[PDB]
Amino acid sequence: MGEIRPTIGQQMETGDQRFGDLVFRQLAPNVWQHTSYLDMPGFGAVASNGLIVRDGGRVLVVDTAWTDDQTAQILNWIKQEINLPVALAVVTHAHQDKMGGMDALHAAGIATYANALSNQLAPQEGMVAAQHSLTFAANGWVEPATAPNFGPLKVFYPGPGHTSDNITVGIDGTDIAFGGCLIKDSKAKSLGNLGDADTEHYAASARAFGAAFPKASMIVMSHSAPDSRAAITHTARMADKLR
Amino acid sequence: MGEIRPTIGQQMETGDQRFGDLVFRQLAPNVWQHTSYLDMPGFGAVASNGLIVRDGGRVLVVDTAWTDDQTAQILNWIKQEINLPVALAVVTHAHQDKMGGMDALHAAGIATYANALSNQLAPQEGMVAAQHSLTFAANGWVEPATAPNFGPLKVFYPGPGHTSDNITVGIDGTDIAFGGCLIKDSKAKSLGNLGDADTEHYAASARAFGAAFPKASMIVMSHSAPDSRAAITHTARMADKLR
Ligand SMILES: CC1(C)S[C@H]([C@H](NC(=O)[C@H](N)c2ccccc2)C(=O)O)N[C@H]1C(=O)O
Ligand SMILES: CC1(C)S[C@H]([C@H](NC(=O)[C@H](N)c2ccccc2)C(=O)O)N[C@H]1C(=O)O
Ligand SMILES: [Cl-]
Ligand SMILES: [Zn+2]
Ligand SMILES: [Zn+2]
Ligand SMILES: [Zn+2]
Ligand SMILES: [Zn+2]
C-alpha cells in the first residue's frame, strides 16, 4: 500500500525501503541507491537515483535529490540507518535531478564537489554551485589534489555526452559504477533529454565510461534500476545513431 | 540535419515525412501514423502518435495532436498529400495528447466521436468534447448505431486502465491495432502516467485489448514506435504488479 509509481523511472521492488517521500535500496553491504520523485502536474512523478556509500567511518553521497527538502530527507535516512558522518557529496552535473538540493547539503555543513564546469554552469542552470571544483586530466581521471579524501570514489570525466559537464563515479572494492544521466538501461528506447547533449561525442563518452570501470558489473544510473554492462553497450549503440 | 529527437517517443527513421512540426510514417498502403511533439521545459519533447486511415474515397483519423495548430497541420497534410476528405475522427480518451486539437477538427467541419465517458470527462480536463458519443456493449465492442459509417475502424472499449475512459481501435483489412496510451512498448520500464489509472483493472483491460484483436501483429501506441504483441503482454505483466 501507498506505493509511488513513477511515470519515468523504475518501479518499486522487493527490498526497497520507503522513507518519507523517498525510496532506498541496498545494492551491496556498503552501498545504497537513493530515489527521489519530482511530481509534474498532468504527467506524474519522475524518479531520480543517486548513491550513498559507507566507506570506513564516513558516508559519501553521489548526487542530491531533486529538491532541498528531499535531500534533507536523504541526510535524515543516513543518520538513522548508518549513523556515521557524511564526509562529502559529489554531484554528477548541473541539472535539477543531480544538483537541486545543494542548499540542504550546505545547511548540514557537508563539503560539496562538482566538475569545475558544473559549478560554472550552475548559475545559468538555476543550481547552487558546490563548494569545491573537481578538475580532470586529459585522460579523464580526476586530478587527485582536487578530490581530497574521496577514498573508494574514483571520479572519471568521460567526455561530453548527456551534457558537456557530466562525470561518472566507480566505487573501489565493489562491482558498482555510477553513470548518472549519461548511461541509459539496456532496454531503453531513447537517450532521454538530448537538449544539452554532444551528439558527435556521446558514443565515445559512453564507451570511455565502460573502459574506465572494467570491474563494474552493476551499472547504476539516474532513471533506471541497476543494470548489467549491456547498459553501456546499448547506450553507445543508440548514441552511434546520432552521428 | 534538423531532426526532432524526442525525450519520449520514437526517433526519426528512413521513410518518415517531416511536415512543419509533424512527422508522418506510413505503416501500410492505407495507414499512416501521425506524430506531434509537446515541448516540456527542462525535459524535452514528448511525441504523441495517432492514425490516418484511407478508406476508399475518404480518410478517417484516430486522435488529435497535442494542439489545435498541430492538428490543423495534420489536416493540411491529409488534404495536400493524400488528397481525400476526412470523414470523421475518433479520439481515444480525454487527455491533451489525444484530444488537445478538437477545435481544429470542428472548425474544419469534421464529425468527431469519443466514448460518452470521454465527453463527460472532457470539460473537467479542459478538453473540447467530441460532437458524438460512442457507447459500448458489455463485452467492450462499440454499439454500431453510435458509430455510423466507421468503415474499417473497429472500436473497442477494453475496460478502465490508463484512464476510466480509454478506448482502442483496430483497422479492419489490416494487421494493425491501436492501443493509444493504454499500451506501452515491450521494453517499457513503466506504464507512464498512472495518476488517472485504474490499477486494479489495468492488466485485464490490456489483455482484453489483445483478445479483441487476436490476429493484429502490428500494435501502434501513443508514445513509442509500432511494436509486436509483446507490447500488450509486457504491459499486462507490468499492470499485474500494480494489484
Ligand atoms: C530524465 C530527463 C529526461 S530530465 C533530467 C534533466 N532535467 C531536469 O532536471 C529538469 N529540471 C526537469 C524538468 C521537468 C521535468 C523533469 C526534469 C535533463 O534535462 O537532463 N534528466 C534527463 C535524462 O536523464 O535524460
Ligand atoms: C506520456 C504521458 C506520460 S503524459 C500523457 C497525458 N498527459 C497529458 O496529456 C498532460 N496534459 C501533460 C501535462 C504535462 C506534460 C505533458 C503532458 C496523461 O496524463 O495521460 N499521456 C501519458 C502516458 O501516455 O503515459
Ligand atoms: Cl496502493
Ligand atoms: Zn542532465
Ligand atoms: Zn536525468
Ligand atoms: Zn492519458
Ligand atoms: Zn499518453
Strand A17-19 and strand A22-28: the pairing is antiparallel
The per-residue DSSP string of A96-154 comes to: HHHHTTHHHHHHTT-EEEEEHHHHHHHHHHT-PPPSEEE-B-TTSBB-GGGSTT-TTEE
Mutate to test the pocket of ligand 2, among B99, B193, B202, B242 (most ligand atoms within 8 A of CB): B193
Q: How far is CA A236 from the centre of its chain?
A: 18
**For residue A93, which atom of ligand 1 is closest to its CA?**
20
Q: Taking CB atoms and an 8 Å cutoff, what residues of chain A touch B224?
A: 189
Q: How far apart are CA A213 and CA A175, in angstroms?
A: 9
Q: How far apart are CA A114 and CA A41, in angstroms?
A: 31
B24: phi > 0 → left, psi -120 to 50 → alpha, else beta; which? beta
Q: Which residues make beta-bridge pairs with B53?
A: B31, B60
> Taken in order B5, B10, B15, B20, is the CA torsion positive or negative?
negative
Are A44 and A93 in contact by the 8 Å Cβ rule? The answer is no
| Domain containing residue A201: CATH number | 3.60.15.10
B15: phi > 0 → left, psi -120 to 50 → alpha, else beta; which? left
Given an 8 Å threshold on Cβ–Cβ distance, is A10 in contact with B40? Answer: no
Are B178 and B191 in contact by the 8 Å Cβ rule? The answer is no
Q: What is the 3-state secondary structure (H, E, C) of B191-226?
A: CCCCCCCCCCCHHHHHHHHHHHCCCCCEEECCCCCC
Q: How far apart are CA B133 and CA B167, in angstroms?
A: 12
Residues in chain A: 243
Distance between terminal CA atoms of chain A?
46
Q: How far apart are CA A192 and CA A163, in angstroms?
A: 12
Are A50 and A77 in contact by the 8 Å Cβ rule? The answer is no
Q: How far apart are CA B86 and CA A12, in angstroms?
A: 45
Greatest distance between any 2 Cα atoms in chain A? 50
Are A84 and A59 in contact by the 8 Å Cβ rule? The answer is yes
**Strands in chain A per DSSP E:** 17-19, 22-28, 31-40, 44-55, 58-62, 86-91, 111-115, 132-134, 153-156, 168-171, 176-178, 218-220
> Taken in order B3, B218, B178, A188, is the CA torsion positive or negative?
negative
Instruction: Output the CA–CA distances (angstroms, integers) from residue B125 to A196, B71, B122, in the order listed.
Output: 33, 18, 5
Are A159 and A208 in contact by the 8 Å Cβ rule? The answer is yes
Tell me the residues of B at the A interface, defined by beta carbons under 8 Å apart: 5-11, 40, 42-44, 96, 185, 187-195, 199, 224-225, 238, 241-242
Say how many Å lie between the CA of residue A93 and the centre of ligand 5: 9
Are A169 and A178 in contact by the 8 Å Cβ rule? The answer is yes
Q: Which residues make beta-bridge pairs with B19?
A: B22
DSSP H/E element including A240: helix A230-240
A30 is in an annotated binding site: no
Q: How far apart are CA B152 and CA B142, in angstroms?
A: 13
Edge-to-edge strand order for the sheet containing B86-91? B17-19, B22-28, B31-40, B44-55, B58-62, B86-91, B111-115, B132-134
Integer Rg of chain A from CA: 16
Q: How far apart are CA A142 and CA A151, in angstroms?
A: 13
Are A149 and A88 in contact by the 8 Å Cβ rule? The answer is yes
Q: How far apart are CA B26 and CA A234, in angstroms?
A: 27
A181 is in an annotated binding site: yes
Q: How far apart are CA A61 and CA A99, in angstroms?
A: 12
DSSP H/E element including B38: strand B31-40
Instruction: Of B169, B134, B136, B157, give the one whose Cα is nearest residue B60.
Output: B169
B193: Cβ below 6 Å to ligand 2? yes
Are A69 and A53 in contact by the 8 Å Cβ rule? The answer is no
Are B178 and B34 in contact by the 8 Å Cβ rule? The answer is no
Say which residues have a Cβ less than 8 Å from residue B208's Cβ, sequence separation at least 6: B140, B156, B158, B159
For A230, how many CA atoms within 13 A lie in the half-sphere containing its CB? 6
Read off the DSSP letter of residue A235: H
Question: Can you list the alpha helix ranges (DSSP code H) found in chain B?
Answer: 68-77, 96-99, 102-107, 116-121, 202-212, 230-240
Q: How was this structure determined?
A: X-ray
Given an 8 Å threshold on Cβ–Cβ distance, is A44 in contact with B192? Answer: yes
Query: What dihedral angle (degrees, nearest 10) is formed by the CA atoms of A87, A93, A96, A98?
Result: -40
* From A11, A43, A195, residue closest to B190, measured CB to CB: A11
Neighbour tally for B17: CB within 10 Å: 12
Angle (nearest 5°) at CA A73 between A68 and A75: 95
Residues in chain B: 243
Integer Rg of chain B from CA: 16
Q: How far is CA B157 from the centre of its chain?
A: 13
- The identity of residue B172, as a single letter, is D
The boundaries of the domain holding residue B4 are 1-243
Our count of domains for chain A comes to: 1
* From B5, B6, B194, residue closest to A5, measured CB to CB: B194
Instruction: Output the CA–CA distances (angstroms, integers) from residue A80 to A12, A19, A52, A153, in the order listed.
Output: 21, 11, 13, 23
Q: Taking CB atoms and an 8 Å cutoff, what residues of chain B touch A10?
A: 189-190
